[PDB]
Amino acid sequence: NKCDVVVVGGGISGMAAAKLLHDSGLNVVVLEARDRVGGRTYTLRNQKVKYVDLGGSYVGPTQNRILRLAKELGLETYKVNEVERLIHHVKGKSYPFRGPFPPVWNPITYLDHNNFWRTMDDMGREIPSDAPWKAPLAEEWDNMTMKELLDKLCWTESAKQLATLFVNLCVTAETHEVSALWFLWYVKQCGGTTRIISTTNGGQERKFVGGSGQVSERIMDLLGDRVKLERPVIYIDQTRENVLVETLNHEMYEAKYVISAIPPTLGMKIHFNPPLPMMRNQMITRVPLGSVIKCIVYYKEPFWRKKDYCGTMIIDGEEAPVAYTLDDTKPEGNYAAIMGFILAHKARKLARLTKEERLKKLCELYAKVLGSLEALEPVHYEEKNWCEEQYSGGCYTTYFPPGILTQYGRVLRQPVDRIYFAGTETATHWSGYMEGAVEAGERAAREILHAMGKIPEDEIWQSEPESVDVPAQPITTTFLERHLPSVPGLLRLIGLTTI
Amino acid sequence: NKCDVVVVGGGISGMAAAKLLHDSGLNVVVLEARDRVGGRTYTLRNQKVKYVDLGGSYVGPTQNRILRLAKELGLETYKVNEVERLIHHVKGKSYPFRGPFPPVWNPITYLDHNNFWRTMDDMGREIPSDAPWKAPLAEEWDNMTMKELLDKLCWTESAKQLATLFVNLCVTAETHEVSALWFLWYVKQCGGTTRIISTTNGGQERKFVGGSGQVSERIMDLLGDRVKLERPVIYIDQTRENVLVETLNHEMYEAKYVISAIPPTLGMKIHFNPPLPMMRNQMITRVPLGSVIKCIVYYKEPFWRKKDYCGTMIIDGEEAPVAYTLDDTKPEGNYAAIMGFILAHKARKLARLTKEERLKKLCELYAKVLGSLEALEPVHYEEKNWCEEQYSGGCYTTYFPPGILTQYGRVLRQPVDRIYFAGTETATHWSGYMEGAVEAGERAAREILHAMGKIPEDEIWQSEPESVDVPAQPITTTFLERHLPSVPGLLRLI
Ligand SMILES: *Cc1cc2c(cc1C)N[C@]1(C(CC=O)c3ccccc3)C(=O)NC(=O)N=C1N2C[C@H](O)[C@H](O)[C@H](O)COP(=O)(O)OP(=O)(O)OC[C@H]1O[C@@H](n2cnc3c(N)ncnc32)[C@H](O)[C@@H]1O
Numbered sequence: 001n002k003c004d005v006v007v008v009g010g011g012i013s014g015m016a017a018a019k020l021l022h023d024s025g026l027n028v029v030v031l032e033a034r035d036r037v038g039g040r041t042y043t044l045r046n047q048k049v050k051y052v053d054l055g056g057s058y059v060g061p062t063q064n065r066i067l068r069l070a071k072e073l074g075l076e077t078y079k080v081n082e083v084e085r086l087i088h089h090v091k092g093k094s095y096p097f098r099g100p101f102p103p104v105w106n107p108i109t110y111l112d113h114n115n116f117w118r119t120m121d122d123m124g125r126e127i128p129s130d131a132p133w134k135a136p137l138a139e140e141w142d143n144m145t146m147k148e149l150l151d152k153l154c155w156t157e158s159a160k161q162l163a164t165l166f167v168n169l170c171v172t173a174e175t176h177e178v179s180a181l182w183f184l185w186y187v188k189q190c191g192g193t194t195r196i197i198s199t200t201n202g203g204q205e206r207k208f209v210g211g212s213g214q215v216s217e218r219i220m221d222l223l224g225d226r227v228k229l230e231r232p233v234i235y236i237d238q239t240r241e242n243v244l245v246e247t248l249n250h251e252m253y254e255a256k257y258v259i260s261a262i263p264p265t266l267g268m269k270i271h272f273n274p275p276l277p278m279m280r281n282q283m284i285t286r287v288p289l290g291s292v293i294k295c296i297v298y299y300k301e302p303f304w305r306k307k308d309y310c311g312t313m314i315i316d317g318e319e320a321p322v323a324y325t326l327d328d329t330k331p332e333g334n335y336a337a338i339m340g341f342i343l344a345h346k347a348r349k350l351a352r353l354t355k356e357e358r359l360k361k362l363c364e365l366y367a368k369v370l371g372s373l374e375a376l377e378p379v380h381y382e383e384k385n386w387c388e389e390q391y392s393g394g395c396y397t398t399y400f401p402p403g404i405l406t407q408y409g410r411v412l413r414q415p416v417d418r419i420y421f422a423g424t425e426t427a428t429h430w431s432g433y434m435e436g437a438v439e440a441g442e443r444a445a446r447e448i449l450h451a452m453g454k455i456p457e458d459e460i461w462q463s464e465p466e467s468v469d470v471p472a473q474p475i476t477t478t479f480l481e482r483h484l485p486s487v488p489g490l491l492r493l494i495g496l497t498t499i
Numbered sequence: 500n501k502c503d504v505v506v507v508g509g510g511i512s513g514m515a516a517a518k519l520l521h522d523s524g525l526n527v528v529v530l531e532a533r534d535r536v537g538g539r540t541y542t543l544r545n546q547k548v549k550y551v552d553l554g555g556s557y558v559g560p561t562q563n564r565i566l567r568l569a570k571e572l573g574l575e576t577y578k579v580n581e582v583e584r585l586i587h588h589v590k591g592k593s594y595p596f597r598g599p600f601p602p603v604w605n606p607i608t609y610l611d612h613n614n615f616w617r618t619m620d621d622m623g624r625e626i627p628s629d630a631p632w633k634a635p636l637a638e639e640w641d642n643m644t645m646k647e648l649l650d651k652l653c654w655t656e657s658a659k660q661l662a663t664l665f666v667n668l669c670v671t672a673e674t675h676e677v678s679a680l681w682f683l684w685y686v687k688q689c690g691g692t693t694r695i696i697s698t699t700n701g702g703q704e705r706k707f708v709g710g711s712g713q714v715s716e717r718i719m720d721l722l723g724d725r726v727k728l729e730r731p732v733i734y735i736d737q738t739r740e741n742v743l744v745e746t747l748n749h750e751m752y753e754a755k756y757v758i759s760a761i762p763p764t765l766g767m768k769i770h771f772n773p774p775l776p777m778m779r780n781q782m783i784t785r786v787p788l789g790s791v792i793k794c795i796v797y798y799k800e801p802f803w804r805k806k807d808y809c810g811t812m813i814i815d816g817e818e819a820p821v822a823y824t825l826d827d828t829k830p831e832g833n834y835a836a837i838m839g840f841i842l843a844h845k846a847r848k849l850a851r852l853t854k855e856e857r858l859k860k861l862c863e864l865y866a867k868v869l870g871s872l873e874a875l876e877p878v879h880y881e882e883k884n885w886c887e888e889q890y891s892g893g894c895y896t897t898y899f900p901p902g903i904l905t906q907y908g909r910v911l912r913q914p915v916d917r918i919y920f921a922g923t924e925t926a927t928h929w930s931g932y933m934e935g936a937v938e939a940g941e942r943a944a945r946e947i948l949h950a951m952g953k954i955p956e957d958e959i960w961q962s963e964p965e966s967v968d969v970p971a972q973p974i975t976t977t978f979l980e981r982h983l984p985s986v987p988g989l990l991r992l993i
């Protein structure tokens with residue numbers, strides 16, 4: 001019944017908030033809708049896989065808060081395999097490449113690719129991390145989808161195709177579904193294009209030994225019976241002295257403050273008395289999550305390594321169910337596996353098939369891409385379609401359609417009386433990731449510590465010391481990368497000499 | 500506890516479904532979240548206004564279902580005042596005009612405006628009312644916003660400003676927020692641009708004497724205590740023999756079937772056991788409602804009529820709070836009033852202000868547009884911001900952002916086990932309107948009757964005879980309107 005703070009949601013963000021509050025000597029309860037903690041992180045354990053992450057999994061340099069939290073809980077990371085060649089499969093044909101990015105040989109196509117990525121980062125520098133609506137051209141960029149932007153910037157189909165796949169992979173949505181301002185923000189708040197897409201030196205470098213679900217589970221161990229499983233919150237009342245929070249199984253909790261640690265749109269599942277202020281009321285109907293099936297196909301051996309492929313495949317084309325894969329083999333070298341994402345409209349399209357039919361499509365794809373008949377002999381298959389989760393709404397995260405971020409963005413973490421907002425969607429650095437969940441959870445907890453007079457305002461927003469275990473290499477450009485002209489820049493140079 | 504059908508939502512759609520099932524001899528219960536019925540229709544009474552519609556209000560020809568249902572409930576209509584001249588206010592100046600549409604004098608601009616409305620209607624003709632995702636170019640049009648379409652079609656800033664205002668007024672959303680495919684379907688399924696925007700012979704022809712809120716109130720009167728007020732539904736369990744529907748105040752209802760008669764996104768307020776199927780689970784997170792404040796300024800007399808203005812103003816620009824107005828005077832000539840909509844982003848921006856501040860801004864606009872100091876002396880003011888409503892989510896209706904209609908559209912009225920779907924959003928003719936609400940409620944009711952073996956499949960979808968009181972005239976075009984070239988077509992011809 002009675003406590004200091006009710007945390008709604010027992011994913012990373014809610015667990016991280018409850019831990020900070022508990023450590024500060026406050027009585028907290030966590031109310032969790034599911035029969036488990038972890039939310040968008042979920043580690044499945046059985047004999048055939050040992051363990052496998054079916055949700056969030058990858059951590060990388062600059063993600064210092066999740067790395068510190070997991071380290072403090074006794075967790076270790078290992079490196080995702082990138083020793084052998086990556087593959088870029090384009091127009092039915094595979095192009096092995098060393099290094100982080102697929103090489104472009106045609107000089108014109110090269111000027112267009114270079115300019116695309118450079119401009120994305122150039123535009124991002126204009127966007128404040130903590131207030132994207134404040135960018136000088138916010139309105140202009142928000143009233144445009146990513147599709148319109150790619151149509152404007154990319155002077156070759158090659159660049160447009162790769163940029164489209166990049167959008168699909170980063171935000172599990174179609175270029176036409178998403179605001180250009182929002183997507184440019186999302187990339188910039190992760191540290192830029194390189195940092196977001198890279199394995200070595202980027203968001204995909206590492207995973208946790210034993211799975212990422214251990215972060216939430218181990219916080220549950222520390223909190224004991226303070227975590228209430230199968231308590232979907234249905235009702236929040238702020239009319240009286242103390243906040244009343246009701247769950248679906250008719251339990252009532254009473255607190256001084258509430259942290260909402262759930263995807264913004266899932267706030268729709270709760271009835272509010274008094275009603276939410278107008279802007280939030282409408283915002284939560286405007287912020288859908290992406291669509292993705294995460295698929296892991298298990299083999300006897302990591303046969304791709306023998307052919308000198310690491311297992312990273314960037315796969316273009318409508319015919320392909322999976323647009324991106326990584327080696328999901330255990331750090332020990334066993335349970336050989338390929339992890340692939342079925343992204344956006346394909347998640348929708350292929351959900352109609354059975355498990356076995358999807359498995360068949362993935363193997364036949366991998367066989368073609370890796371030039372290997374062995375791909376046709378899987379030993380096991382696991383998958384999770386996140387579109388079907390009542391208490392997630394999708395994965396990886398919330399995207400903003402055109403128009404929304406400039407109109408409703410400033411509401412996302414604005415307190416509603418005694419309700420404070422966490423969840424990765426409210427982060428200012430790696431929002432959408434496990435990293436952002438920790439940031440938002442800990443910041444929301446500290447907003448409440450401030451409200452209670454226990455800390456100064458200057459301590460609500462805290463920087464994180466850099467991990468000594470996963471240090472970040474800076475993102476560098478070369479002279480030619482900075483100053484080579486765009487395609488229309490080259491055309492302007494041509495018409496100037498011939499005049 | 501026990502009944503044949505639970506209807507969730509006591510708006511026009513739920514009430515229409517409940518009346519039909521009740522009329523068939525079934526035991527129905529209506530579970531309504533608010534302390535009132537009507538939903539997006541709300542009629543307020545006091546001695547200053549007598550009665551005023553703060554939500555949905557207008558009906559017109561081809562809306563034969565709402566007209567029939569209202570007539571059966573003992574309601575009468577009256578005609579919205581359009582006797583005198585309409586006003587187009589452009590670049591700080593008023594241009595009065597007779598006839599339905601604002602005249603255009605520049606020859607390039609004329610061709611541009613003419614081509615725009617024609618192309619809209621031409622595109623609509625390839626879009627099936629009952630399945631817009633089956634349009635030949637469905638994905639192409641769905642992956643474009645209306646702003647992109649407008650940038651592509653409109654060669655003049657004049658045509659683009661007016662087309663933008665048209666989108667704003669029709670769907671209370673910005674051109675960049677909405678799917679081209681969806682908006683084109685929305686117009687088509689109201690009978691086309693002329694039908695949707697016209698007062699005489701269109702959607703704004705008439706109001707109900709006493710208010711439209713009586714539609715819901717009078718069906719509640721029929722149903723008596725079968726309607727449960729302040730019963731927000733929180734939980735629907737379909738794992739057992741009968742369906743179990745729980746409310747927030749802890750009541751349990753048990754039925755053979757359920758009708759969901761609420762805006763699709765509001766289905767999110769309900770926890771489902773078992774979970775909804777995937778496509779619906781995501782669909783209901785992707786479908787917001789628009790933003791609008793409806794504002795009514797009262798005056799001692801309808802002074803605009805003296806200047807040969809009807810009170811309808813079409814007002815261009817960012818500066819103006821209200822882009823569109825109608826005379827809201829009672830048919831008797833008293834309670835003189837101008838109704839105006841604060842649309843889309845302006846509803847967000849101006850909600851920051853106080854009621855008095857909004858009133859002042861409106862009066863100053865009307866004084867400018869009508870060219871009258873009398874506009875500065877209001878006797879009363881009523882307004883309702885629909886954006887703040889927990890159990891509506893906005894007004895007028897649900898809009899589809901780019902990508903969604905082709906991906907999720909077929910999900911809208913697909914039953915989930917024993918849950919059938921009503922609400923104006925699921926209609927195929929005048930969806931978004933009170934008309935669509937009746938169509939959908941009655942169709943979802945008949946789906947259940949068919950699932951009960953009471954009627955054949957053929958009878959789920961039923962045509963409506965034309966209203967004898969409000970007959971429709973056909974929509975005509977001239978030879979020149981059909982064959983005059985577009986701007987690029989005049990250019991290609993030169
Ligand atoms: C808000 C508004 C709506 C309409 C207009 C104006 C405003 C301010 N105007 C019109 C126009 C529509 C144009 O697209 C219009 C605009 C400009 C020029 C001409 C016309 C109007 O003039 N005519 C018209 O026909 N319709 C208008 N507007 C829309 C209609 O009002 C609307 O379509 C219908 O009222 C919708 O009916 P519905 O039955 O499908 O749905 P709703 O009314 O929302 O009822 C749902 C009820 O459900 C309750 N509820 C929600 N969650 C619940 C839970 N969980 N449990 C139980 N009950 C729940 C809710 O409380 C509602 O009562």
Ligand SMILES: *Cc1cc2c(cc1C)N[C@]1([C@H](CC=O)c3ccccc3)C(=O)NC(=O)N=C1N2C[C@H](O)[C@H](O)[C@H](O)COP(=O)(O)OP(=O)(O)OC[C@H]1O[C@@H](n2cnc3c(N)ncnc32)[C@H](O)[C@@H]1O
Pocket residue numbers: 008009010011012013014031032033034036037038039040041054055056057058059169170171203204231232233234261262263266269270292294386391392394395396397422423424425432433434435436437
């Ligand atoms: C689903 C998924 C998520 C992530 C990835 C993959 C999948 C399949 N992958 C990650 C990447 C994100 C990229 O943008 C990524 C992809 C590709 C390459 C590199 C990276 C990943 O690999 N790393 C990573 O850091 N994050 C990934 N993904 C996102 C994370 O999973 C996600 O960001 C965090 O898990 C979010 O944490 P939270 O903010 O705490 O939010 P939830 O997990 O959703 O927890 C909410 C809990 O609330 C409960 N709930 C909901 N409603 C309730 C009510 N009414 N009452 C009580 N409780 C309620 C719900 O059950 C949750 O437990």
